[PDB]
Amino acid sequence: MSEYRPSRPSNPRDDWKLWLVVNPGTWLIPLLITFLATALIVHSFVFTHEAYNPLTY
């Protein structure tokens, strides 16, 4: 006669509860740094088909 089941969470109501798990003081910048790593990569792939590169001679 005992169990512990967790509340089915409906997002984004409970969205903030992340920072109870992820300490932004440690991870905000790792995050921001990786959105950069992403942005840089996507940039390369479209920067390389010169049709979308702004230089072209």
């Binding site: 969205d15 903030w16 992340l18 920072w19 109870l20 798990v21 992820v22 300490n23 932004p24 979308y52």
Partner: protein, 43 residues
């Protein structure tokens, strides 16, 4: 105390600036796809 160690009030106060920053970012971002599509359509 939680895993991250923040309060409810820190997580909530933080999350505000996050999603506020996020949106204007994702709005700024949404804008450039417009321009590019004008400038160089794709698909």
């Amino acid at each position: 105390n939680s895993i991250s160690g923040l309060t409810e009030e820190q997580a909530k106060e933080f999350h505000e600036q996050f999603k506020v920053v996020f949106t204007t970012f994702v709005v700024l971002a949404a804008a450039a796809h417009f321009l590019v599509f004008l400038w160089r359509p794709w698909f």
